[PDB]
Coordinates of C-alpha atoms and ligand atoms in Angstrom, one line a residue:
Chain M
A1 CA 95.4 135.8 82.6
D2 CA 97.1 133.2 84.2
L3 CA 96.9 132.9 88.5
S4 CA 100.3 132.6 90.0
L5 CA 101.6 133.5 94.0
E6 CA 104.3 135.6 95.4
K7 CA 106.3 136.2 99.1
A8 CA 104.6 139.2 101.2
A9 CA 104.7 138.7 104.4
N10 CA 104.3 136.8 107.8
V11 CA 100.5 135.9 110.4
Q12 CA 101.7 138.2 112.9
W13 CA 100.6 141.7 115.4
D14 CA 103.0 144.4 114.3
Chain E
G1 CA 101.9 133.1 105.4
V2 CA 101.0 136.1 103.9
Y3 CA 100.9 135.9 100.0
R4 CA 100.3 138.1 96.8
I5 CA 97.7 136.9 93.9
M6 CA 98.7 138.0 90.4
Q7 CA 97.9 137.0 86.9
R8 CA 100.0 136.8 83.8
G9 CA 99.6 139.6 80.6
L10 CA 100.6 138.6 77.7
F11 CA 104.6 140.1 79.0
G12 CA 102.5 141.5 82.9
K13 CA 101.5 141.0 85.8
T14 CA 98.9 142.7 87.8
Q15 CA 97.6 141.7 91.7
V16 CA 94.0 140.5 91.6
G17 CA 93.7 139.7 95.1
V18 CA 95.8 138.9 98.5
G19 CA 95.5 135.1 99.6
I20 CA 96.5 133.3 103.1
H21 CA 99.1 129.9 103.2
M22 CA 99.5 128.3 106.7
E23 CA 99.7 124.7 105.4
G24 CA 98.4 122.8 103.6
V25 CA 95.4 124.8 102.5
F26 CA 96.0 128.3 100.2
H27 CA 92.6 130.7 101.6
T28 CA 91.4 133.6 99.0
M29 CA 88.0 135.3 98.6
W30 CA 86.0 132.9 95.7
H31 CA 85.8 136.2 92.8
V32 CA 89.3 137.1 92.6
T33 CA 90.1 133.7 91.1
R34 CA 86.8 132.3 90.1
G35 CA 87.6 128.7 90.8
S36 CA 91.1 128.9 88.6
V37 CA 94.5 127.4 89.4
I38 CA 97.7 129.2 90.9
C39 CA 101.0 127.6 91.6
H40 CA 104.6 129.5 93.2
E41 CA 105.7 125.6 90.3
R42 CA 99.7 124.0 91.1
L43 CA 96.9 124.2 93.8
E44 CA 93.5 123.3 93.1
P45 CA 90.6 124.0 94.4
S46 CA 88.6 121.9 96.7
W47 CA 86.4 124.1 98.3
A48 CA 84.6 127.0 98.4
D49 CA 81.2 129.3 98.7
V50 CA 80.0 131.5 96.4
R51 CA 77.3 133.5 97.8
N52 CA 79.0 134.5 100.7
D53 CA 82.6 134.8 98.5
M54 CA 85.0 132.3 99.4
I55 CA 87.0 129.9 98.4
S56 CA 90.6 127.3 99.5
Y57 CA 93.3 125.7 97.3
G58 CA 94.6 122.4 98.9
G59 CA 92.5 120.8 101.6
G60 CA 89.1 122.4 103.7
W61 CA 89.3 125.8 105.6
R62 CA 92.1 125.6 108.2
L63 CA 91.5 128.7 109.1
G64 CA 88.5 128.6 111.9
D65 CA 89.4 131.5 115.5
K66 CA 87.3 134.7 115.1
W67 CA 86.5 137.7 116.2
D68 CA 85.2 137.8 119.7
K69 CA 82.9 141.3 119.7
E70 CA 85.4 143.6 121.4
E71 CA 89.1 143.7 120.9
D72 CA 90.9 145.6 118.1
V73 CA 91.7 144.1 114.9
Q74 CA 95.2 144.5 112.1
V75 CA 94.2 143.6 109.0
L76 CA 97.5 143.1 107.2
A77 CA 96.6 145.2 103.9
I78 CA 99.1 143.9 100.8
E79 CA 98.4 146.5 98.4
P80 CA 99.5 145.8 94.5
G81 CA 102.9 147.5 94.1
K82 CA 103.2 148.2 98.7
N83 CA 104.7 147.2 101.4
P84 CA 102.6 145.4 103.6
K85 CA 101.1 147.6 106.6
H86 CA 99.2 146.1 109.7
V87 CA 96.7 148.4 109.9
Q88 CA 95.0 148.4 113.5
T89 CA 91.4 149.3 114.1
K90 CA 88.5 148.3 116.0
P91 CA 85.4 146.2 114.2
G92 CA 82.2 147.1 115.0
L93 CA 78.4 144.8 114.5
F94 CA 76.0 146.0 111.7
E95 CA 74.3 139.7 112.2
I96 CA 77.2 140.9 110.4
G97 CA 81.4 141.4 111.9
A98 CA 82.8 144.5 109.6
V99 CA 85.5 147.1 108.7
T100 CA 85.8 150.7 108.9
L101 CA 88.5 150.4 106.5
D102 CA 89.5 151.6 103.5
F103 CA 92.1 149.7 100.8
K104 CA 92.0 149.6 97.2
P105 CA 92.0 147.3 94.6
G106 CA 94.3 144.9 94.2
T107 CA 93.2 144.1 97.9
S108 CA 90.5 142.6 98.2
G109 CA 91.0 139.4 99.7
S110 CA 94.1 140.5 102.7
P111 CA 94.3 138.9 106.1
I112 CA 92.7 140.6 109.6
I113 CA 94.7 139.3 112.5
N114 CA 93.6 138.6 115.6
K115 CA 95.4 139.7 119.3
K116 CA 97.7 138.2 118.5
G117 CA 97.5 136.7 116.8
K118 CA 95.4 134.1 114.0
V119 CA 94.0 135.3 111.0
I120 CA 89.6 135.8 112.0
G121 CA 88.1 136.7 108.7
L122 CA 89.4 138.0 104.9
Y123 CA 89.6 141.9 104.2
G124 CA 87.3 142.9 100.7
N125 CA 83.3 142.7 100.4
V126 CA 81.4 148.8 105.7
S127 CA 84.1 146.4 104.0
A128 CA 83.0 143.4 106.1
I129 CA 85.2 140.7 107.3
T130 CA 84.3 137.2 106.1
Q131 CA 85.1 134.4 106.9
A132 CA 83.8 130.6 106.7
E133 CA 82.5 128.7 110.1
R134 CA 83.0 125.5 109.0
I135 CA 85.3 122.7 109.7
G136 CA 86.6 121.2 106.4
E137 CA 85.8 119.8 104.6
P138 CA 86.9 120.0 102.2
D139 CA 84.2 118.5 99.0
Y140 CA 84.6 114.8 98.2
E141 CA 83.5 115.2 94.6
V142 CA 82.8 111.2 93.6
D143 CA 85.1 109.7 90.7
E144 CA 82.9 107.5 89.0
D145 CA 85.6 105.2 87.2
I146 CA 84.7 104.4 91.4
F147 CA 82.4 102.4 89.6
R148 CA 83.9 100.7 86.3
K149 CA 83.9 96.6 86.7
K150 CA 87.5 95.3 87.6
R151 CA 88.9 98.4 89.1
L152 CA 89.5 98.4 92.5
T153 CA 90.3 101.1 95.1
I154 CA 92.6 102.3 97.8
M155 CA 91.0 104.8 99.8
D156 CA 94.0 105.9 102.2
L157 CA 92.8 109.9 103.4
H158 CA 94.8 109.7 107.1
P159 CA 92.7 108.4 110.4
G160 CA 89.5 110.7 111.0
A161 CA 90.1 112.4 107.6
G162 CA 86.4 111.3 107.0
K163 CA 85.9 108.2 105.4
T164 CA 82.9 106.0 106.8
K165 CA 81.0 109.3 108.3
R166 CA 81.5 111.5 104.8
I167 CA 83.1 110.3 102.5
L168 CA 81.6 106.6 102.3
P169 CA 77.4 107.5 102.4
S170 CA 78.4 109.7 99.1
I171 CA 79.7 107.5 97.3
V172 CA 76.3 104.7 98.4
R173 CA 74.1 107.3 97.2
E174 CA 76.2 108.2 94.5
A175 CA 76.7 103.9 93.7
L176 CA 72.2 103.8 94.1
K177 CA 71.9 106.7 91.2
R178 CA 74.2 104.3 89.1
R179 CA 71.4 101.7 90.0
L180 CA 74.8 99.5 91.4
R181 CA 73.9 96.0 93.5
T182 CA 76.1 97.6 96.7
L183 CA 77.7 96.1 99.4
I184 CA 78.6 97.8 102.5
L185 CA 81.0 95.8 104.5
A186 CA 81.4 96.9 108.8
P187 CA 84.3 95.7 110.8
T188 CA 82.1 95.1 113.5
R189 CA 78.0 95.1 114.5
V190 CA 78.1 98.4 116.7
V191 CA 80.3 100.1 114.2
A192 CA 77.7 98.5 111.7
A193 CA 75.0 100.1 113.7
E194 CA 77.1 103.7 114.1
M195 CA 76.9 103.6 110.2
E196 CA 73.5 103.0 110.2
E197 CA 72.7 106.2 111.9
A198 CA 74.9 107.7 109.3
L199 CA 72.8 106.2 106.1
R200 CA 70.1 108.1 107.0
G201 CA 67.5 107.7 104.9
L202 CA 69.1 105.3 102.6
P203 CA 67.9 101.8 102.2
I204 CA 70.3 99.7 103.6
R205 CA 69.6 96.6 104.7
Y206 CA 71.4 95.4 108.6
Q207 CA 72.4 91.1 106.8
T208 CA 72.9 88.7 110.6
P209 CA 75.4 85.7 110.4
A210 CA 71.9 83.4 111.1
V211 CA 70.6 84.0 106.9
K212 CA 72.5 82.5 104.5
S213 CA 71.6 85.2 101.8
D214 CA 68.5 87.3 101.6
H215 CA 67.5 88.8 98.4
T216 CA 64.3 91.1 97.7
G217 CA 65.1 91.9 94.4
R218 CA 64.7 95.7 94.9
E219 CA 67.3 98.5 95.2
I220 CA 68.9 97.5 99.1
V221 CA 72.2 98.6 99.9
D222 CA 73.1 95.5 102.0
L223 CA 75.3 96.5 104.9
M224 CA 77.1 93.5 106.5
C225 CA 80.4 93.0 109.6
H226 CA 83.6 91.1 107.2
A227 CA 82.8 87.9 109.0
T228 CA 79.1 87.8 108.0
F229 CA 80.2 88.4 104.4
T230 CA 82.6 85.5 104.5
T231 CA 80.5 82.8 106.4
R232 CA 77.4 83.6 103.9
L233 CA 80.7 82.9 101.1
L234 CA 81.4 79.5 102.8
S235 CA 77.8 78.5 103.4
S236 CA 75.5 79.9 101.2
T237 CA 74.4 77.7 97.6
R238 CA 73.5 81.6 95.8
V239 CA 76.1 83.5 94.6
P240 CA 76.3 88.0 95.8
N241 CA 76.9 89.5 93.1
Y242 CA 76.8 93.2 93.8
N243 CA 78.6 95.4 91.7
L244 CA 80.3 97.5 94.3
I245 CA 82.0 96.1 96.9
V246 CA 82.9 99.7 100.1
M247 CA 85.3 97.6 102.7
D248 CA 85.6 99.4 105.4
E249 CA 88.7 99.5 108.2
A250 CA 90.4 97.0 105.8
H251 CA 93.1 97.1 107.1
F252 CA 91.3 93.7 109.7
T253 CA 93.2 91.2 110.1
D254 CA 91.2 89.0 111.7
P255 CA 91.3 86.0 109.0
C256 CA 86.9 86.5 107.9
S257 CA 88.4 89.7 106.9
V258 CA 91.4 89.1 105.2
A259 CA 90.0 86.2 103.1
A260 CA 87.1 88.7 102.3
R261 CA 89.1 90.8 100.6
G262 CA 90.9 88.3 98.7
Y263 CA 87.9 87.1 97.2
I264 CA 86.5 90.8 96.1
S265 CA 89.7 90.9 94.5
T266 CA 89.3 87.9 92.8
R267 CA 86.3 88.9 91.9
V268 CA 87.3 92.3 90.8
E269 CA 89.1 90.3 88.7
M270 CA 86.6 88.1 87.2
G271 CA 85.6 91.7 86.3
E272 CA 82.3 91.4 87.5
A273 CA 82.7 93.8 90.5
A274 CA 84.4 97.6 91.6
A275 CA 85.8 97.5 95.0
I276 CA 86.5 99.9 97.5
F277 CA 88.9 99.0 100.4
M278 CA 88.1 102.3 103.1
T279 CA 91.9 102.4 105.7
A280 CA 94.8 105.2 106.5
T281 CA 97.3 101.8 106.6
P282 CA 96.3 99.5 103.3
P283 CA 98.8 96.4 103.3
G284 CA 102.8 97.7 103.7
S285 CA 102.1 101.2 105.4
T286 CA 105.1 102.3 107.3
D287 CA 104.6 105.4 108.5
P288 CA 103.4 104.6 113.2
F289 CA 103.1 108.3 112.8
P290 CA 100.3 110.1 110.0
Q291 CA 98.6 113.1 109.3
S292 CA 95.1 114.1 111.6
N293 CA 92.9 116.2 112.0
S294 CA 94.1 118.0 115.2
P295 CA 98.1 118.0 116.9
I296 CA 99.2 115.0 118.2
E297 CA 101.4 115.2 121.3
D298 CA 103.1 111.8 120.4
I299 CA 105.3 110.9 124.5
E300 CA 108.1 108.8 124.0
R301 CA 108.0 106.2 127.7
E302 CA 108.1 103.8 130.0
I303 CA 104.4 101.8 130.4
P304 CA 103.7 99.9 133.1
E305 CA 102.4 95.9 132.2
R306 CA 100.8 94.8 135.2
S307 CA 99.9 96.0 137.9
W308 CA 102.3 99.5 139.6
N309 CA 103.0 100.8 142.5
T310 CA 104.9 103.6 142.1
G311 CA 106.9 105.8 139.5
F312 CA 103.6 106.5 137.1
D313 CA 101.9 109.7 138.2
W314 CA 101.7 110.3 135.1
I315 CA 99.2 107.7 134.1
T316 CA 96.4 108.3 137.5
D317 CA 97.3 112.7 137.7
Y318 CA 96.3 112.9 134.0
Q319 CA 93.1 114.9 134.2
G320 CA 91.4 113.9 131.4
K321 CA 89.9 110.3 129.6
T322 CA 92.3 107.4 128.3
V323 CA 92.2 104.6 125.8
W324 CA 95.4 101.8 126.8
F325 CA 96.2 99.1 124.2
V326 CA 96.5 96.1 125.8
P327 CA 98.1 92.8 124.1
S328 CA 95.8 90.5 125.8
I329 CA 92.5 90.2 127.8
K330 CA 95.2 89.1 131.1
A331 CA 97.0 91.9 130.8
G332 CA 93.9 94.2 130.5
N333 CA 92.1 92.6 133.5
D334 CA 96.3 93.3 135.5
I335 CA 96.0 97.2 134.3
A336 CA 92.2 98.1 134.9
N337 CA 92.7 96.2 138.3
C338 CA 95.4 98.2 138.8
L339 CA 93.3 101.7 138.0
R340 CA 90.8 101.0 139.9
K341 CA 92.9 100.2 142.9
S342 CA 93.6 104.0 142.6
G343 CA 89.7 105.0 142.8
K344 CA 89.5 105.2 138.5
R345 CA 86.6 103.7 136.2
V346 CA 87.1 101.7 133.8
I347 CA 85.6 99.8 130.6
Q348 CA 87.7 97.1 129.7
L349 CA 86.7 96.5 125.8
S350 CA 87.5 93.0 123.4
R351 CA 86.3 91.1 120.6
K352 CA 83.3 88.5 122.6
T353 CA 82.2 91.6 124.7
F354 CA 82.8 94.4 122.2
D355 CA 78.6 94.7 121.3
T356 CA 77.9 94.5 124.8
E357 CA 81.0 97.0 125.7
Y358 CA 81.4 99.5 123.7
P359 CA 78.1 101.1 123.3
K360 CA 79.1 101.8 127.4
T361 CA 81.7 104.0 126.6
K362 CA 79.1 106.3 125.2
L363 CA 76.6 106.2 128.0
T364 CA 77.8 105.8 131.1
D365 CA 81.2 107.8 132.4
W366 CA 84.9 106.8 132.7
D367 CA 88.6 107.3 133.7
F368 CA 90.4 104.7 131.0
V369 CA 89.3 102.5 128.2
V370 CA 91.4 98.9 128.2
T371 CA 91.5 97.5 125.5
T372 CA 93.0 95.0 123.1
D373 CA 93.2 95.7 119.3
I374 CA 90.2 94.8 118.1
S375 CA 89.2 99.3 118.6
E376 CA 91.5 100.1 115.7
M377 CA 88.7 99.7 113.6
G378 CA 87.0 102.4 113.6
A379 CA 85.8 102.1 117.5
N380 CA 85.5 106.2 118.3
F381 CA 86.5 107.6 122.0
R382 CA 86.0 110.5 123.1
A383 CA 89.7 110.4 124.8
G384 CA 91.5 112.9 125.1
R385 CA 95.3 109.7 126.3
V386 CA 96.0 107.0 123.8
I387 CA 98.3 104.3 126.2
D388 CA 100.3 102.6 123.8
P389 CA 102.6 100.1 124.8
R390 CA 102.9 98.6 121.6
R391 CA 102.5 95.5 122.3
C392 CA 100.3 92.2 121.1
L393 CA 99.5 88.8 120.8
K394 CA 100.8 86.9 118.0
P395 CA 98.4 83.4 116.8
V396 CA 101.0 81.1 115.1
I397 CA 100.8 77.5 113.7
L398 CA 103.9 75.5 115.6
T399 CA 105.2 72.2 113.3
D400 CA 107.4 71.5 115.9
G401 CA 106.1 68.0 116.5
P402 CA 102.6 67.6 116.9
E403 CA 101.1 71.0 115.6
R404 CA 99.1 73.1 117.2
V405 CA 98.1 77.1 117.8
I406 CA 99.8 79.3 121.0
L407 CA 99.5 83.2 121.7
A408 CA 102.9 84.0 120.5
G409 CA 105.1 87.4 122.4
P410 CA 103.8 89.8 123.8
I411 CA 105.1 90.9 120.7
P412 CA 105.4 95.0 119.0
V413 CA 102.7 95.6 117.4
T414 CA 102.4 96.0 113.2
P415 CA 103.6 100.3 112.4
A416 CA 99.7 100.1 110.6
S417 CA 98.5 98.7 114.0
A418 CA 99.9 101.4 116.2
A419 CA 99.8 104.9 113.7
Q420 CA 95.2 103.5 113.6
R421 CA 95.9 103.5 118.1
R422 CA 97.5 106.4 118.3
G423 CA 94.6 107.7 115.5
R424 CA 92.4 107.1 118.0
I425 CA 92.8 110.1 118.6
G426 CA 93.8 113.9 117.5
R427 CA 90.5 113.3 115.6
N428 CA 88.8 116.1 117.2
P429 CA 89.5 119.9 115.7
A430 CA 88.5 121.2 118.6
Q431 CA 90.2 119.7 120.3
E432 CA 93.8 120.8 120.1
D433 CA 96.7 118.4 122.9
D434 CA 95.2 115.6 122.5
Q435 CA 97.9 112.7 123.8
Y436 CA 99.2 109.4 122.3
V437 CA 101.9 108.5 124.8
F438 CA 104.3 105.4 123.6
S439 CA 106.6 102.6 124.1
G440 CA 108.8 100.3 121.8
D441 CA 109.0 100.1 118.3
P442 CA 106.6 98.5 116.0
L443 CA 107.8 95.3 113.9
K444 CA 106.9 94.8 110.6
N445 CA 107.4 91.1 109.9
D446 CA 103.9 89.0 110.6
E447 CA 105.0 86.1 108.1
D448 CA 104.3 83.7 110.5
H449 CA 100.8 84.9 112.1
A450 CA 98.2 81.8 111.9
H451 CA 95.4 84.8 110.2
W452 CA 97.4 84.2 107.3
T453 CA 96.5 80.8 106.3
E454 CA 93.4 80.9 108.3
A455 CA 92.2 83.2 105.3
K456 CA 93.4 80.3 103.2
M457 CA 91.4 77.9 105.0
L458 CA 88.8 79.7 104.6
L459 CA 89.4 80.9 101.0
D460 CA 90.7 77.7 99.4
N461 CA 86.7 76.3 100.8
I462 CA 84.8 79.6 98.7
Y463 CA 83.1 77.5 95.8
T464 CA 82.4 80.3 92.4
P465 CA 80.5 79.2 89.5
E466 CA 83.8 80.0 86.9
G467 CA 86.0 77.5 89.0
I468 CA 88.0 79.8 89.6
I469 CA 90.3 79.1 93.3
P470 CA 89.7 82.9 95.2
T471 CA 93.5 83.7 96.6
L472 CA 94.6 85.9 99.1
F473 CA 94.2 90.6 97.8
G474 CA 98.3 91.1 96.3
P475 CA 100.2 92.5 99.6
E476 CA 98.7 89.8 101.4
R477 CA 100.4 87.1 99.6
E478 CA 103.7 86.7 101.0
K479 CA 102.4 86.6 103.9
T480 CA 101.5 82.7 104.1
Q481 CA 103.9 80.0 102.0
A482 CA 100.7 77.7 101.7
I483 CA 100.1 77.0 98.6
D484 CA 96.5 77.7 97.1
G485 CA 93.9 75.1 97.1
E486 CA 95.9 72.5 99.4
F487 CA 93.5 73.7 101.9
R488 CA 90.2 72.4 100.2
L489 CA 87.5 70.5 101.9
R490 CA 85.0 68.9 99.8
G491 CA 81.6 66.6 100.3
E492 CA 81.1 66.6 104.5
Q493 CA 84.6 67.2 105.6
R494 CA 83.7 70.7 104.0
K495 CA 80.4 71.3 105.1
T496 CA 81.9 70.5 109.1
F497 CA 83.8 72.7 109.0
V498 CA 82.5 76.2 108.0
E499 CA 79.9 74.4 110.8
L500 CA 82.3 74.3 114.3
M501 CA 82.6 77.7 112.6
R502 CA 79.5 78.9 112.5
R503 CA 77.8 77.7 114.9
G504 CA 80.2 75.4 117.6
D505 CA 82.6 79.0 117.4
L506 CA 85.4 77.4 117.3
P507 CA 88.7 78.6 115.4
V508 CA 89.2 78.8 111.6
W509 CA 92.6 76.1 112.4
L510 CA 90.7 73.8 115.1
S511 CA 87.6 73.8 113.2
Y512 CA 90.0 72.5 109.5
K513 CA 92.1 70.0 112.1
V514 CA 88.2 68.6 113.4
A515 CA 86.8 68.7 110.1
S516 CA 89.9 67.3 108.0
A517 CA 90.9 64.3 110.8
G518 CA 87.4 63.7 109.3
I519 CA 84.9 63.8 112.5
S520 CA 81.9 64.8 112.5
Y521 CA 79.9 67.6 113.9
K522 CA 78.3 66.3 116.8
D523 CA 81.1 63.8 118.2
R524 CA 82.7 65.2 120.7
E525 CA 85.7 61.8 122.0
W526 CA 88.6 64.3 120.4
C527 CA 88.0 67.0 123.1
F528 CA 88.6 64.2 125.3
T529 CA 91.0 62.6 123.9
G530 CA 94.4 64.9 124.4
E531 CA 98.0 63.8 126.0
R532 CA 98.8 65.2 129.5
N533 CA 100.3 68.5 127.6
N534 CA 96.5 68.7 126.3
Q535 CA 95.6 69.6 129.7
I536 CA 93.1 72.7 129.8
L537 CA 93.6 75.3 132.0
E538 CA 91.0 77.2 134.5
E539 CA 92.7 80.3 137.3
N540 CA 94.8 77.3 137.9
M541 CA 92.4 74.5 137.4
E542 CA 92.6 71.5 135.4
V543 CA 88.8 71.8 133.4
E544 CA 87.1 68.9 133.7
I545 CA 83.3 68.5 132.0
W546 CA 80.3 66.7 132.3
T547 CA 80.2 65.7 129.1
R548 CA 76.1 64.7 126.7
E549 CA 75.9 61.2 128.4
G550 CA 76.4 61.9 131.8
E551 CA 80.4 61.4 132.3
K552 CA 83.1 63.2 134.2
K553 CA 86.3 64.2 132.1
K554 CA 89.2 66.1 132.1
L555 CA 89.4 68.5 129.4
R556 CA 92.4 67.5 126.7
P557 CA 91.8 68.5 123.7
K558 CA 94.0 65.8 120.5
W559 CA 94.2 69.6 119.4
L560 CA 95.2 72.1 120.9
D561 CA 94.1 75.9 119.5
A562 CA 95.2 79.0 122.1
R563 CA 92.9 80.9 122.0
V564 CA 89.5 79.2 122.8
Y565 CA 91.3 79.7 126.6
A566 CA 93.4 82.3 126.8
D567 CA 90.0 84.2 125.7
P568 CA 88.0 83.6 129.2
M569 CA 84.7 84.3 127.3
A570 CA 85.8 81.8 124.3
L571 CA 86.6 79.2 127.6
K572 CA 82.8 79.8 128.9
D573 CA 82.0 78.6 124.9
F574 CA 84.4 75.8 124.4
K575 CA 83.5 74.5 127.6
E576 CA 79.5 74.8 126.2
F577 CA 80.7 72.8 123.0
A578 CA 83.3 70.2 124.4
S579 CA 79.9 69.0 126.7
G580 CA 77.6 68.6 123.8
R581 CA 75.3 71.6 124.9
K582 CA 76.6 73.7 121.7
Ligands
ADP1 N1 78.4 111.3 116.0 C1 79.3 112.2 115.4 N2 79.3 113.6 116.4 C2 79.9 114.5 115.8 N3 81.9 114.0 114.8 C3 81.7 113.1 115.0 C4 80.9 111.9 115.4 N4 81.3 110.5 114.4 C5 82.1 110.7 114.5 N5 82.8 112.0 113.8 C6 83.9 112.7 114.1 O1 83.6 112.8 111.8 C7 85.6 113.3 111.8 C8 85.5 111.7 110.4 O2 84.8 110.9 111.5 P1 85.9 109.4 110.0 O3 84.7 109.4 108.6 O4 85.2 108.2 111.2 O5 87.1 108.9 109.4 P2 87.6 108.2 109.1 O6 88.4 109.0 107.9 O7 89.0 107.3 110.0 O8 86.7 106.8 109.1 C9 86.2 112.3 112.4 O9 86.5 114.0 112.9 C10 85.5 112.3 114.5 O10 85.8 112.7 115.4
CL2 CL1 91.2 104.4 108.5
CL3 CL1 90.5 90.0 121.7
MN4 MN1 86.5 105.2 109.4

């Protein structure tokens, strides 16, 4: 049950 | 920015939530990770809230923005197996801010974006907007290996990290649970006085240099100045068997602080104590621009050395408070006089006036503090700008002919100094446009600095029952060529050396010169025996003294220490010493 990360998007409006 | 948090199966992978980087802190909700490590290739949990369901990785809670109760927000929903979708909505009050949007399992921890456009909370758990009300901290789980005998820890978290105000109390609280005999060292009395308030409830006892030792037999923590510790070591007939010594602002390079580090280090080496040096800038520091709590604007430009008539409008046009570091009291007098001419309210700080003047920087209002390097040692200012021409005077022992001490320079400060000067500001998370205005490059090499050999004069005269001569702290040993024990005095010369410093208030080099010449404490003939060039001047006048037995004599010392006459308080003190009243 190991945990990893993947990019989704940047913090922005619209 | 926004990251999917995945859970590895035997051969698959599923999204269990969402998190946010900044940096350098990864933010998500507790129930998503349950405090487990995540890695992009490891991120360790450093702050958590289980009741409100929040957790952060790599440091304290970075996102301190909140919903203004009125406007629209955008949930940047990161749904598993779906593209990132921005959804605008209007939250309501129920008091808790909440959105009326529903996203499917795995989207918990999605950022809710401000207008525009910071993150004001996390989607998940009506659906609530979960947001922390806190600043940091992160959390200081005290490492118990810092309490082992024969261990020395350098606690070098950046300026403002919380070493003094947050970590130190924690350690003292912990050391008291372990029933350790604890000593806390502060750079100055006023700083110690500040520490006394922040250690509220604890059994801390402030120790003055007027007492040589003070043993109660009770579970009690001693608090004292770096210099008080050293003075007690030179004068007390009692060995102080603390098994934990915390020195705060351990970058202090005054001889007494240097000697203290060496003794504490010897004590660690013998196996009798654990030691902790707290400073963002330990010996050997190279980085003048370290991390801060808030962004600093580092502005490089010409800075006046004395009174100016034009071309520095930026100095006086500035609308906040400024801390201005000068190389000397005299340079400070010139700068302060110029500022007051423009109707600016200025407070001046130096070593000898620090105790009276520094309190006023809190309970009066001012525009400028004009200070010597002494403000690098834990002096806190509610200010927005540092002016730092990165300049200082350096005491140097000259051997070219008759031995004397001069103040050389002004010369460039060490990188450590520049960092600590800069470090006065950017400490307040709520204040993001602090300025560091500076000129010139810093200078590493200070091998010719009188403070290191003076440190060895102190060290060589502390005796241990083990017969070991205390020596300079490891990283500081290269800073003098002086031989271990070459400054050791005994019997009456030793006793007079200590007394000339303790009651005479003389510099170490001078006190050593007089005592090792075989002169008794009360004998002042040497203040008048010097050659033509040793004539002391004050405000452009040849100083004449009215002696003990009623003679009017020119102040003309056999040994010339510039520090007794470059500092106006030291001159006044020295004149009293020469007169025989002291
Ligand atoms: N009286 C006070 N009230 C509130 N905050 C303070 C006070 N004194 C200091 N602070 C803040 O506490 C934080 C940690 O300070 P401190 O522990 O002195 O940092 P350092 O790690 O440099 O020793 C800083 O942001 C500082 O501005
Ligand atoms: Cl520091
Ligand atoms: Cl000073
Ligand atoms: Mn500090």
